[PDB]
């Protein structure tokens, strides 16, 4: 059943709300935080100085 | 005084006897 007795604005709003109600939310892949890449502390690493061995 | 605590504390802003925030609050650690 349908007819023009319903205001076009009302029909558009109803259709949009019906579409949005069943829409499954999806991730946009934005506003991401940096991923940690830990490295060994300085005291667990060789000292800066290095010369020609032999 | 010994009983002054009760008298002083009587003047408090608390929701139904519970000391709660009056609005949403958010704390972050830098």
């Amino acid at each position: 059943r349908d007819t023009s007795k319903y205001d076009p604005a009302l029909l558009e709003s109803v259709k949009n709300e019906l579409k949005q109600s069943a829409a499954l939310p999806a991730d946009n892949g934005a506003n991401k935080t940096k991923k940690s890449k830990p490295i060994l502390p300085d005291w667990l690493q060789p000292k800066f100085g290095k010369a020609f061995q032999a | 005084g010994v009983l002054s605590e009760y008298n002083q504390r009587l003047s408090k802003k608390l929701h139904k006897g519970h000391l709660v925030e009056d609005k949403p609050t958010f704390f972050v650690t830098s």
Binding site: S36, K37, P38, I39, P41 | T29, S30
Partner: protein
């Protein structure tokens, strides 16, 4: 000389350094113990500073900081190695 454009350029680098501070797990945990040990003092705040405030620094703030803090009584110059004392 601290130019506004230079500060604008370095804002991104400082923010990236603040975010990457987590790479050194021991250092970040040291900053966390400083934060938890001194909650009623600015001494607890992380050395890299608050992230959201990093973009708020201007040239004038840096100039005032260096002018009011880098004073003669605060400077100690130490020398070692093959250096002529006189």
């Amino acid at each position: 000389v601290f130019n506004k454009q230079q500060v604008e350029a370095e804002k991104e680098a400082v923010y990236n350094n603040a975010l990457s501070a987590q790479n050194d797990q021991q250092g970040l945990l040291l900053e966390n113990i400083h934060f938890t040990a001194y909650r009623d003092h600015y001494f607890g705040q992380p050395t890299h500073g608050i992230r959201e405030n990093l973009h708020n620094i201007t040239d004038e703030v840096v100039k005032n900081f260096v002018k009011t803090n880098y004073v003669g009584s605060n400077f100690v110059v130490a020398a070692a190695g093959n250096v002529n004392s006189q």
